[PDB]
Design a binder for this molecule. Structure first.
Ligand SMILES: *[C@@H]1O[C@H](CO)[C@@H](O)[C@H](O)[C@H]1NC(C)=O
Ligand SMILES: *[C@@H]1O[C@H](CO)[C@@H](O)[C@H](O)[C@H]1NC(C)=O
Ligand SMILES: *[C@@H]1O[C@H](CO)[C@@H](O)[C@H](O)[C@H]1NC(C)=O
Ligand SMILES: *[C@@H]1O[C@H](CO)[C@@H](O)[C@H](O)[C@H]1NC(C)=O
Ligand SMILES: *[C@@H]1O[C@H](CO)[C@@H](O)[C@H](O)[C@H]1NC(C)=O
Ligand SMILES: *[C@@H]1O[C@H](CO)[C@@H](O)[C@H](O)[C@H]1NC(C)=O
Lengths: 173, 138, 49, 323
């Protein structure tokens, strides 16, 4: 914008002062001063708006380093894409890069389940898992990994009687 | 009209009333495969009627008049303007270059314009007595 | 017409682009380059005279 | 059991201006005088196109989070819970749901034809059908397809074991759900009905989406109204001062109008930049709520719901989302 005239005779000073010496030069210089003052003010305002957008990104990076790197996050998709496990920071030019280590289940299988079990007129519910039929017995397993554990009084708890449940299955305990 | 422009006029030849429209203007954008894989380009005339801007190119009535240019009967209407130089297809893809309302252009095998492919069509077998449990991880 | 002339470090004009021959030539004179990444770029406006 | 609603804007209209048709009409001399000011039309065009591209990025970040488009089950009755009025209706013509139709009617605005201004509005990249398609895959994947969603893959839970698994996550036992399933299912259905009634026969509940539309219209009205005012010249209209003013006494009256019209344009673009930053901060929040409330169970207080969060469902809206 410095090589741009704004209605004046010339866009370079020392070439209006060389060919003029008095009020005639003042009238031309005022046109240049006005034009160069606007393009400088426009630049500053656009920098203020950009600076705010990059402060919001620097605040989010500070929250990620505190939550993902110094701990283990329970927030979904905040750190990685699976079940967050760890994280490492690496410096980059005018920025930072995170290496999230996550856990991803892969295989999958089909089972038949139930909400409860009826043994002696009482209902047994699971504590920290689900009931899986497998195909030969009845087991209780954790929801994220497959590991059938034999049912026992330490796996389940007695709650209520054997009347109000949709789908109890009779089995030993 | 509401903007205080001249929306109509009455002829002084003892006749009826007419309307006035602002001729036809807009913008143009050039789609390029990247200059590393081809030299052909497509042009988008934004917010116009293909019929109106196809005859205008015939009578030489466009201010951006390109010396060596022609329209090989590949005019496409879309809704974001008139597209010239890309042939329509009916095989959705992943939207290499975006255009308008659910229209995208890609190079593949000349420039081809299609409709966006949201994702993979999948179904889930919902039953009331079955569960799925992972057996392996990574 | 408008031309886009390329100058060599030795100080002599080497290449040029005519900014009214092709739609592609107009694109080159707008981004001031000779090779351009893939994408869609908006250029000057058009009127029906 | 309670159900509450939350409205968030995620996008706004995409505008563009013809810097030469606005400042000058069909005048050759006005264009020549404009070129003296250098690169001001190009700056404004690039600034407005940057905003326009950003609006499409906002929507893709919130809605395009599922890589698979699950089919609507066609049962819509899981255990005792009535999931219709959320999913699309197969025999209806529209691809939306009942509640989404209510939202699209309520938020009212303030084939190709142009205006003498030089202003225009571009269309969004994702049509309303695509946006409505996305929210159906998220709802259908939440009822069926198990909680395991996002971080993994669908795992086919019967939806009687979700609420048991989600009751277990707020500090109650599983037997609380199973023994009171009929009561819990009934309260769920009633809560959705009241949402229907409130939406159908209310006046103003989507003011956040309304404010976005009204503010955009006021900005454009002001820009047009400035065209009908001189800035110290003989008159605002050109060719009426450009004819009977010789050919050098008219070159200083034109420079008065041109300088005034550039400022009106520059002021407009600067305020669109500040407004866009506010929408971006709102679209980022809606993306976090779509990931932490819909695809998971949130333990942050007052983040998703009001009481103890059980689950959430997204519904589309004009330039916004409803949870
Ligand atoms: C489980 O059964 C469903 C229904 O037939 C089927 O789609 C799915 O592939 C089965 N899972 C496995 C691991 O075979
Ligand atoms: C699942 O559906 C079958 C088919 O009617 C039914 O017999 C069974 O009781 C159902 N299970 C539950 C838990 O509702
Ligand atoms: C899990 O997958 C890995 C690699 O695919 C394989 O080496 C391993 O044996 C698998 N584990 C089981 C239990 O199948
Ligand atoms: C520039 O000049 C030098 C010597 O004058 C020559 O070697 C070179 O090829 C010329 N062109 C370049 C460096 O591109
Ligand atoms: C579910 O709600 C819809 C909406 O009114 C109703 O038409 C339908 O009958 C309900 N389903 C049942 C099983 O009552
Ligand atoms: C283009 O014009 C024709 C007739 O002039 C009309 O039938 C058609 O609807 C128009 N298309 C537009 C305005 O998109």
């Amino acid at each position: 914008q410095l090589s741009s005239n704004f209605g004046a005779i010339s866009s370079v000073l020392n070439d209006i002062l060389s060919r003029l010496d008095k009020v005639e030069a003042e009238v031309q210089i005022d046109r240049l001063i006005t034009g160069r003052l606007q393009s400088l003010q426009t630049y500053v305002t656009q920098q203020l708006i950009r600076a705010a957008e990059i402060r919001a990104s620097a605040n989010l990076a500070a929250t990620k380093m505190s939550e993902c790197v110094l701990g283990q996050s329970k927030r979904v998709d905040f750190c990685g894409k699976g079940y967050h496990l760890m994280s490492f920071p690496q410096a980059a030019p005018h920025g930072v890069v995170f290496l999230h280590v996550t856990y991803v289940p892969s295989q999958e299988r089909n089972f038949t389940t139930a909400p409860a079990i009826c043994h002696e007129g009482k209902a047994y519910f699971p504590r920290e898992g689900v009931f899986v039929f497998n195909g030969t017995s009845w087991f209780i397993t954790q929801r994220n990994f497959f590991s059938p554990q034999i049912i026992t009084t330490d796996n389940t708890f007695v709650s209520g009687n054997c009347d109000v449940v949709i789908g109890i299955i009779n089995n030993t305990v | 009209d509401v903007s205080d422009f001249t929306d109509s006029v009455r002829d002084p030849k003892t006749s009826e009333i007419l309307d006035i429209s602002p001729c036809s203007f807009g913008g143009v954008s050039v789609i390029t495969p990247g200059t590393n894989a081809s030299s052909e380009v497509a042009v988008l005339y934004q917010d116009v009627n293909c019929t109106d801007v196809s005859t205008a190119i015939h009578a030489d009535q466009l201010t951006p008049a390109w010396r060596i240019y022609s329209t090989g009967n590949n005019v496409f209407q879309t809704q974001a303007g008139c597209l010239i130089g890309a042939e329509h297809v009916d095989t959705s893809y992943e939207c290499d270059i975006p255009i308008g309302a659910g229209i995208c252009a890609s190079y593949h095998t000349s420039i081809v314009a299609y409709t966006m492919s949201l994702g993979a069509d999948s179904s889930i077998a919902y039953s009331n007595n079955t569960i799925a449990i992972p057996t392996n991880f990574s | 017409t408008t031309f886009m002339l390329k100058y060599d470090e030795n100080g002599t004009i080497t290449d040029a682009v005519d900014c009214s021959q092709n739609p592609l030539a107009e694109l080159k004179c707008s981004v001031k380059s000779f090779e351009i990444d893939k994408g869609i770029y908006q250029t000057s406006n058009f009127r029906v005279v | 059991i309670s159900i509450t609603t939350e409205v968030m804007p995620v996008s706004m209209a995409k505008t563009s201006v013809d810097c030469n048709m606005y400042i000058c009409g069909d005048s050759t001399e006005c264009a020549n005088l404009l070129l003296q000011y250098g690169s001001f039309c190009t700056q404004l065009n690039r600034a407005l196109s940057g905003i326009a591209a950003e609006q499409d990025r906002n929507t893709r970040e919130v809605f395009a989070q599922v890589k698979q488009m699950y089919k609507t089950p066609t049962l819509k009755y899981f255990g005792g819970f009535n999931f219709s009025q959320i999913l699309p209706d197969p025999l209806k013509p529209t691809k939306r749901s009942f509640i989404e139709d209510l939202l699209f009617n309520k938020v009212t605005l303030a084939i190709c034809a142009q205006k003498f201004n030089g202003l225009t509005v571009l269309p969004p990249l994702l049509t309303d059908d695509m946006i409505a398609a996305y929210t159906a895959a998220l709802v259908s994947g939440t009822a069926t397809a198990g909680w395991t969603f996002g971080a993994g893959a669908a795992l086919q839970i019967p939806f009687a074991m979700q609420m048991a698994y989600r009751f277990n996550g707020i500090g109650v036992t599983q037997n609380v759900l199973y023994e009171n399933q009929k009561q819990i299912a009934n309260q769920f259905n009633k809560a959705i009905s009241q949402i229907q009634e409130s939406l159908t026969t209310t006046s103003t509940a989507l003011g956040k989406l309304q404010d976005v539309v009204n503010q955009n219209a006021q900005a454009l009205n002001t820009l047009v109204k400035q065209l009908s005012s001189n800035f110290g010249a003989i008159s605002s209209v050109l060719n009426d001062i450009l004819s009977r003013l010789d050919k050098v006494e008219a070159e200083v009256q034109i420079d008065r109008l041109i300088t005034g019209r550039l400022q009106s344009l520059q002021t407009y673009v600067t305020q669109q930049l500040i407004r866009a930053a506010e929408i971006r901060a709102s679209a980022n929040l809606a993306a976090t709520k779509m990931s932490e409330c819909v695809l998971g169970q949130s333990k942050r207080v007052d983040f998703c719901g009001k009481g103890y969060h059980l689950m959430s469902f997204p519904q589309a809206a004009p330039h916004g989302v409803v949870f």
